[PDB]
Amino acid sequence: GDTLDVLLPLRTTGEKAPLFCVHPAGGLSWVYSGLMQHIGADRPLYGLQARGLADPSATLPSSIEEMAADYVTQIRGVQPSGPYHLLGWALGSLVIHAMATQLRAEGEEVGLLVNLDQYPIDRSRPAPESQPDQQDALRIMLDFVGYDMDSPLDYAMVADVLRERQSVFANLDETAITALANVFANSRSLFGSFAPQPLDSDVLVIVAEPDETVPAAELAARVEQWRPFVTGKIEYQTVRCSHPHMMQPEPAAEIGRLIAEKLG
Amino acid sequence: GDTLDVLLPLRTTGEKAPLFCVHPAGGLSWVYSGLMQHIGADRPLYGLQARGLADPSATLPSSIEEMAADYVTQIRGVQPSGPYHLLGWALGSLVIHAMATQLRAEGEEVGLLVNLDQYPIDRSRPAPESQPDQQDALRIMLDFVGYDMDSPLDYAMVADVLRERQSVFANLDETAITALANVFANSRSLFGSFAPQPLDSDVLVIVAEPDETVPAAELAARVEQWRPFVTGKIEYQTVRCSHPHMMQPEPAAEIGRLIAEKLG
């Protein structure tokens, strides 16, 4: 069916402008469903999913800018105008920045911008800390169908669990599994080539920080790493979880209610 | 077992200096077995394989410079002196370049440098054609056990063929198969951060060119792309195959005999 489409219709019904959510390195946006309960029931909600999944013969984007332009066209087949509201997670945030750059430069209004715990890259000697991690990409997948993390992940395992827990992932075959790994390999080469342009909007970073003994200033200083690319306001909010666990029910509820608060 | 260890003993017997072959992006060096028939039977042959295979708990190298230092120590525990003979294929070639500068700067003698169809990277907009391709990494594996290609590849298939055709790949589990995809993901983020230093040694490039209507000057011009990193001589030789097919019997015979000829 339409499991692996580039445009993922989580909820088309709705009066108010839609919120577009772009995938992490992994490339699937089904994980963003966890916001639906907490963002306005009058809000459409669209996932954006990597090329190379629905079609493994497809030439993957070779730049985040190319990827972003792909996704702007999709969200604009949904939304012709209005304030486009963007959410990303890890590489997604790198994508919505380019998109909002692209929209702003072409006269479109960019509204809400929500970045999920992703910070700028030294393309000099790229940090593994801030570069996409396969096990996290797996942990994000497992969380989507609520696997109990208290039991070194592998694709075959994540698959059967997904294949079983949600039967629109049944018929996700050994082809797709490799296209998942192929798409994720591309994410990392998209890190450390991408140089965000300055963005004249306000943005909202969700800081994933499970250590409550971490001083608040480091949370502001971490988020302020975006200052060469934002001349608007840089607002930030912390969920109490590690990077791959942000769509778990607690952070997803904190995140989703925070998205609604502003979109209202 | 010893299947996925960093130092792969393809042949330990031999009084003459050993040849060290570093893996492609895929990370496995078993494919270099196909030279054994054509390099002198008095020549040790060692494979160098990626960390994170034998142990998927390992922290991968974050730079080719670091990976190269890992492998230099490995090849130095085999040969402590003499002229160090390096072969690489795609990403491996980038790695033997780094090792060679690392040896040269510490007074070691570098001898034979054989680079298999890999050319330097624009780190600003890295070309996907000179970046490692997942399907190519799988075709390299299929070839190792001589799969007849006249039939969009997936990991689970490549593994079963390896599992059957060669029983030292039995017990190659779903963990390792993911560890392969994880190792290959690291390969591409290792491209485009690697800035080779100048190398005062002679290098020999094998140009993969399956199109014979291709003029000869363009093959010298292609190889000369290494000129900012080789102040010593740049010799080249063309096998009539594409990039992932370079260890098939025909090209492996040409390549192995060309290695012997020089080492004699």
Distance from CA of B188 to the nearest CA of A (A): 5
- How far is it, in rounded angstroms, from Cα A19 to Cα A113? 9
Q: Which residues have CB under 8 Å from B163's CB, separation 6+?
A: B169, B170, B172
How far, in Å, are B1, B226, B257 from residue A172 at the CA level? 32, 43, 46
Cβ neighbours of B224 (radius 10 Å): 14
Residue A235 CA: distances (Å) to CA of A112, A120, A220, B247: 11, 16, 9, 55
Torsion of CA A87, A88, A92, A93, to 10 degrees: 100
Residue A160: other Cβ atoms inside 10 A: 11
| Fold category of B7-263 in CATH | Rossmann fold (3.40.50)
- Spatial CA neighbour of B37 closest among B76, B4, B11: B11
Q: Are B262 and B237 within 8 A, CB to CB?
A: no
- Residue with structure tokens 């392969």? B180
As given in the structure block, the two tokens for residue A50 are 């990597």
Nearest to A185 by CA among A135, A134, A138: A134
Instruction: State the Cα–Cα distance between residues A82 and A214, nearest whole angstrom.
Output: 39
Three-state DSSP state, A112: strand
Cβ under 8 Å to A: B residues 197-226: none
Give the Cβ contact number of residue A2 at 10 Å: 9
3-state DSSP helix/strand/coil percent for chain B, to nearest 5? 40, 15, 40
Residue B118 — φ and ψ, nearest 5°?
A: -130, 135
Residues of A in contact with B172 (CB under 8 A): none
Dihedral angle over CA of A48, A49, A55, A59, nearest 10: 90
Q: To 10 degrees, what angle do helices A174-190 and A155-165 make?
A: 120
Query: A26-51 b/e with 16+ CB inside 10 Å = b?
Result: bbbbbbbbbbeebbbeebbbbbbbbb
Instruction: Indicate the Cα dihedral angle A151, A153, A154, A157, nearest 10°.
Output: 30
Encoding tokens for residue B142?
């299929």
Q: Do B188 and A189 touch (CB under 8 A)?
A: yes
Q: With H, G, I as helix, E, B as strand and everything else as coil, classify residue B94.
A: helix
- Residue A211 contacts residue A238 (beta carbons within 8 Å): no
B178 and chain A: CB distance < 8 Å anywhere?
Answer: yes
Please state, in angstroms and as integers, the Cα–Cα distance from residue B131 to each residue in A63, A184, B128, B185, B187, following that order: 13, 15, 5, 12, 9
Token pair belonging to B251? 């090209």
Is residue B72 within 8 Å of residue B98, measured between CB atoms? no
In this structure, are residues B219 and B210 in contact, taking their beta carbons and an 8 Å threshold?
Answer: no
Enter the tokens of residue A29: 């946006």
**DSSP-derived secondary structure for A113-137:** EEEES-----SSS--STTS--HHHH
| A95 neighbors A64 (Cβ within 8 angstroms) | yes
Helices (H), chain B: 64-78, 91-105, 134-144, 155-165, 174-190, 216-223, 249-263
Q: Please give the span between the terminal C-alpha atoms of chain A, in angstroms, as a whole number.
A: 34
CA angle A8, A108, A40 (to 5 degrees): 45
Domain assignments of chain B as residue spans, ordered by start:
7-263
- Contact at 8 Å (CB) between B247 and B140? yes
Element (H, E) at A110: strand A110-116
Pair A34, A45: CB distance under 8 Å? no
Q: Which SS3 state, helix, strand or coil, does residue A236 take? A: strand
Angle, CA B203 vertex, CA B200 and CA B206 arms, to 5°: 160
CB pairs under 8 A between A and B: 94
Q: Burial level of B57, CB count in 10 A (0-12/13-18/19+)? A: exposed
Q: A217 — phi, psi (to 5°)? A: -60, -40
A102 within 8 A of A113, measured Cβ to Cβ:
no
Is the Cβ of B182 closer than 8 Å to some Cβ of chain A?
Answer: yes
Interface test with B, best of A133, A189, A190, A191 (most B CBs within 10 A): A189
DSSP summary character for residue B42? T
Quick check: B110 and B86 in contact, CB under 8 A?
Answer: yes
For residues A19 and A78, what is the distance between their CA atoms, to the nearest angstrom? 11
Bridge-based pairing of strands A45-48 and A19-22 is: parallel
Helices (H) and strands (E) in chain A, counts: 7, 7
* Alpha carbon distance B192, A250 (integer Å): 38
Cα–Cα distance, A217 to A225 (Å, whole number): 13
Experimental structure resolution, Å:
2.4
Contact A192 B192 (CB under 8 A): yes
A-facing residues of B in 110-139 (CB < 8 A) are 123-126, 128, 131, 134-135
- Coil, strand or helix: which one is B257? helix
Question: Which structure tokens are listed for B257?
Answer: 């005999």
Report the residue count for chain B: 264
Residues A86 and A100 sit within 8 Å (Cβ to Cβ): yes
Q: Which residue has the tokens 């003994």?
A: A213
Strand (E) or helix (H) holding B110: strand B109-116
Query: Does B189 touch chain A if contact means CB atoms closer than 8 Å?
Result: yes
Looking at beta carbons, which pairs linking A173-179 to residues 24 or more positions away fall under 8 Å? A174/B154, A174/B155, A174/B156, A174/B157, A175/A56, A175/B152, A175/B154, A176/A4, A176/A53, A176/A56, A177/B154, A177/B155, A177/B156, A178/A56, A178/B134, A178/B153, A178/B154, A178/B155, A178/B156, A178/B181, A179/A52, A179/A53, A179/A56
Minimal CA–CA distance to B175: which of B2, B4, B17, B41? B4
State whether B155 and A174 contact (CB < 8 Å).
yes
Sheet holding A7-11, edge to edge: A7-11, A45-48, A19-22, A84-89, A110-116, A203-208, A234-239
Distance CA B109, CA B127 (A): 33
Pair of tokens at residue B105? 């700067």
- Check residue B3 and report its DSSP letter: T
